[PDB]
Write a protein that binds this ligand. Sequence first.
Ligand code: 9Q6
Ligand code: 9Q6
Ligand code: 9Q6
Ligand code: 9Q6
Lengths: 329, 329, 329, 329
Amino acid sequence: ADLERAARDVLPGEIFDFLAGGSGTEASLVANRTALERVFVIPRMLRDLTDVTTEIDIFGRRAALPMAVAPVAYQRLFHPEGELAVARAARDAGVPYTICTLSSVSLEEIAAVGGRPWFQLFWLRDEKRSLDLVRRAEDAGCEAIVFTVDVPWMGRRLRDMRNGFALPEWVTAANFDFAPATWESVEAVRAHTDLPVVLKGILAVEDARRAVDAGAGGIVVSNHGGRQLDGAVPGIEMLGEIVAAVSGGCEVLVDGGIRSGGDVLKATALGASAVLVGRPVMWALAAAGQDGVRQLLELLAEEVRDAMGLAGCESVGAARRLNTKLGVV
Amino acid sequence: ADLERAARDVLPGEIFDFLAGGSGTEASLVANRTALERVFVIPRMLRDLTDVTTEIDIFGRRAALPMAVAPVAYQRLFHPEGELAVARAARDAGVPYTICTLSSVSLEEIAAVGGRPWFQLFWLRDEKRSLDLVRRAEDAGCEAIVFTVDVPWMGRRLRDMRNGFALPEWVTAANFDFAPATWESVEAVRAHTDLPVVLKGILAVEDARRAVDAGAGGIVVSNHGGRQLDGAVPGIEMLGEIVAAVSGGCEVLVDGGIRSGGDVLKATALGASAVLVGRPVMWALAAAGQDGVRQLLELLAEEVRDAMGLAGCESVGAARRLNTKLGVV
Amino acid sequence: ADLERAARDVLPGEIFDFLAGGSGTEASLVANRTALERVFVIPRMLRDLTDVTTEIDIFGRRAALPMAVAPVAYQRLFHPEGELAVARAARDAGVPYTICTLSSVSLEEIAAVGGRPWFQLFWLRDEKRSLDLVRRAEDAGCEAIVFTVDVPWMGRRLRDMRNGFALPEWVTAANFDFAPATWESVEAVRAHTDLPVVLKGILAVEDARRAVDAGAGGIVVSNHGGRQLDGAVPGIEMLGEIVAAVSGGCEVLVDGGIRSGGDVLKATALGASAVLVGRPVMWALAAAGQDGVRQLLELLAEEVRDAMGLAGCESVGAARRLNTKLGVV
Amino acid sequence: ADLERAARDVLPGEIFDFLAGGSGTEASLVANRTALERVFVIPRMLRDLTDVTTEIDIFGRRAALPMAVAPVAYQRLFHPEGELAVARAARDAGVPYTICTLSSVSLEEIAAVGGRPWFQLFWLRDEKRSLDLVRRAEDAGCEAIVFTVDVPWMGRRLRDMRNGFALPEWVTAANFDFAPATWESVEAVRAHTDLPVVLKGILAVEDARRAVDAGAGGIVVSNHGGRQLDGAVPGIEMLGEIVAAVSGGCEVLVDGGIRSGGDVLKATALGASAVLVGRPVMWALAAAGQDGVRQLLELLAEEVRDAMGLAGCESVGAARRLNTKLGVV
Ligand SMILES: Cc1cc2c(cc1C)N(C[C@H](O)[C@H](O)[C@H](O)COP(=O)(O)O)C1=NC(=O)NC(=O)[C@]1(O)N2
Ligand SMILES: Cc1cc2c(cc1C)N(C[C@H](O)[C@H](O)[C@H](O)COP(=O)(O)O)C1=NC(=O)NC(=O)[C@]1(O)N2
Ligand SMILES: Cc1cc2c(cc1C)N(C[C@H](O)[C@H](O)[C@H](O)COP(=O)(O)O)C1=NC(=O)NC(=O)[C@]1(O)N2
Ligand SMILES: Cc1cc2c(cc1C)N(C[C@H](O)[C@H](O)[C@H](O)COP(=O)(O)O)C1=NC(=O)NC(=O)[C@]1(O)N2
């Protein structure tokens, strides 16, 4: 909110495009928003709101909101403190923060910041490098492995090709000194850790069930922000069916286009356990570093609280039982 | 009609925004209109129109049209005679007028004007202050208590924050010299009055049924003009289901976006007993005081009469039995 | 086609608005088009087209196309020869022409032109004046009475009020030297004539059935070009249901927005026996008098023929058995 | 992609319009795109992509992609090498190329280029001329006869009439030195050749079944690029039903608006065996002759491969089992 404006007139055009971009025609980028805007909540009235709380328990810990910071690589591209700033603010808001495999600061350093860090894994050509990285994460106190499963390789970003965009020399992959994940990769991760494994990028109902059968503690119903298959269904379009198929067997998160506490409320009403928020957290980082993320998070927290109360929900659990109605435009 | 133009070039920008505004992205403001525009009426032909009447009986009294003036606070913000002017015109049109808790003239004075006044209650931190206010209303001859139940607190108006909008010093809360209502608040009102209690802001079908079981004489199916939860379903989208669930157990009114006699006809065909009209009555007040409201009301009366006759309805009851068809744009 | 342009830059603005206009917000004017554009035809292939014919039998006579000229009053408003010109061209195209009650040339004169004239009746305050007018029509060789039943009175034209539009002194109601029709009016017409009675302005399925039970030979499924109830469903939206309810019991025509032979084909595929065409015939009259109508009619005839052949229909009957599919925009 | 721009600023306006154009209002041209954009793919995750192949077997031969070049007449209109250039590139990409009846180079010469050529037949006034042409095709090594069945005659192109467009003198019908096909024409073709007969322009489910019963080896579900009946349903809207009715009885291809490998993936997910691509291949021919077509084909090949992998399909067969979801805009 208001932040995107402030980040546009400050980032190089090509960095902003790397941030804002989808794959191909960006059909799935836009559909993430369209899809949300079509969802109407049916609020409830006249319930006791004496103790409205936005807290949830997830993967063992309490979170202040039903939200985590989404994994986004190379946070130094947006601000010089990069991941550390986002991490500090997330910790101080009581929101999980997801450390990327391609973080521009090492994962041990990010985790040292404390709070409730998660680690996002990309499967690499070498199975041992992947599993090491999982072990580092866990040795460092990470609370979940978010296995990104919708990147057998990177989709085609048309902005980045026509930009000629490339990592400037002062941003690197601090965890280092590119292969398709299968269900066998998932099992290897699962066998190597006692942390919950959360599969990110699930859109098919049967992949959701199979995730549960494979021992995942969670999924993220996501089309990777419209960055992977162009024409992939939005996550929010599949969430409700996926929630009903998994039948409480794992946590179900959603992301893509979450831009307000109203949108969090919509996601929750469709049955999400929590949302991830990606580009907005980068807009706030770029606009004003740590303090800027802290304010995004405060604003989101007040919007969630407000939306929940107006919908007659004293708890996220109540918000999950709200009904919705699909509407026009 | 034509009036909004005339009110824009006369009100301060910030007052007009206080009037026109919704919550958040104004998703629900716009959806109130969108929703109405999608409804098509299926007219009937060749019936006897020898005695077309727009009258209805509601809460004991006869009303000239299936319409009442909606509660809108601080009517002095729009014209110096404020509530008194609107009240006089409503009385002379034979339309109920709803006195607000935050009226800029006292409720006893508004009621003295005569006609068929209703009183809109906000629940206040002190249960005794609320109930006093109910007793004043009734002692003053008000015919219904319209308990507004969709304001456990005020939604977030983005226009008003970015305006910095505030009550100028020459407009005040004349009934005085802010708490969430529950079903227990409703029962306390219901126990304290023999007037019909009308719950305003019901959108869930189960809240409608429960309203009836709680002894409400009416509900208003409403998303508070898009001013409360941003993303709340429009009232008009829920009306038909709500009418069928309550099964004649209480009157069912609707509001939000009613801009013509055709729209009243649409509302009635979806099963509403009557509509409320809010912003238009303020546009006409601001454009030309009492006389201006009188003309809005005459124009609406002729539009309802015209719409009804063209649809083959000699009575509002007939108009409620019309069928509708949802259409594109 | 192309003609509307040519009529705009030739008619007074107010005459063109009288022609182009709908009621209220013109919601139903526009919806007539929208509705047609959403209908897709499912063409058939590889059938024998050796003898493609656009002819139909209706109300006793053969017509060259499944089309008639719609009743439109005061044709002298558009061209000095007015009804006579349209009538001649219709006759020479083999298309029925509907003489209006408010024709700017007498009905006997219009009928003398020959061809297959129909007469459109408005019910007047005096039952005897209406029935006389029916008798004149029949004495004059008219082949059908098109009882317009959707004008208990004229809808509210906003263009005409804000224009101040009025009949110039050189155009009059040549049949003369305003009351609601009921089913009893229909029976009186039906008893007074051996001609088929065709009810025009039927939108409800039950009014269609009742028309058949009342002995109508036809109906016209029509919202009077969006000129009567603003918010009335389009005819084309109701046609298919109406066709199935009447079950061959009377002819079912449709009008509203028919602008091409493709649209005629769409109407026929939805089950219409024929269409009426209104504003386009006036555009062609105003653009170039009789010759101009003759060319509209030739162009329409070639479009129907073309559309039919491409859809694999050798006859209108075949075109009625085509399937359709509703689509987006 | 990017090519259309490059072809616009190089072709005469009237040639480009002959290329880009639909029939009538171009309702069906646009609906081909609209229809595709509404289809969302539901990708699968975590499958083995170790050997992703885009190959299919069709009509006896292996093709490199599930795609063929669509028949487009008078390719010399777009580039001086015309059909020979497109043919060479198609052959080198391993894509079938469809030789037109109205090719601007003879079919024997086009076929000599080698690769996997198909021949598109128009039925001519003389049954013997048609069958000769079939025999030439087969004598020349063509692998399929694509009988175009949606041109009993050419639809009405409004661009071409208002252009006055005509074949310049340096482009001719090199196969020569105009009649409606029936099922009897199909049987005569079928009896005269041992090649698979592929009916192109099937939109009705019953025509699809009957095609199979008539011994067709394939159909192309197509509205001829919006060039034949204006208002014809898009192919992509009918594909899924047609696939299920034919029940593997013949190959089912689709065309109309295929503009990317994502669109090929959408088509395949709806059950197509392969797509045809028309106007894009001409844009690339006009932009840069053979090399330009070679690059279109390489880009398409990488897009298909990318789309497939991101959707978790190692083979076209897998892509056919993907589910889809219809979405808004
Ligand atoms: C610039 C950038 C980079 C990545 C991602 C998103 C953006 C915007 N994303 C997608 C992100 O996690 C959310 O799915 C999406 O952004 C939510 O949508 P939203 O931004 O509208 O709130 C990533 N996902 C991974 O698993 N690993 C990564 O390195 C990551 O590829 N790189
Ligand atoms: C400026 C203003 C103030 C209020 C309201 C509406 C406007 C426009 N409203 C909503 C109103 O009653 C109708 O629900 C809505 O306006 C119909 O929609 P419409 O204006 O499109 O015809 C109120 N409702 C209450 O219960 N109490 C109030 O003090 C009130 O909050 N203040
Ligand atoms: C100017 C004018 C006047 C009339 C009508 C239409 C126009 C445009 N119409 C409606 C017409 O018959 C078709 O229903 C409609 O025009 C088809 O729609 P279309 O024009 O898009 O093709 C009439 N109907 C009657 O019964 N009697 C009349 O005097 C008439 O009121 N006057
Ligand atoms: C200029 C031109 C000429 C023809 C065709 C298409 C264009 C663009 N087409 C339609 C084409 O084969 C595809 O159906 C369509 O172009 C796919 O749509 P797409 O272009 O959006 O990819 C033909 N079809 C035939 O059978 N015979 C022909 O001579 C042909 O009439 N002439």
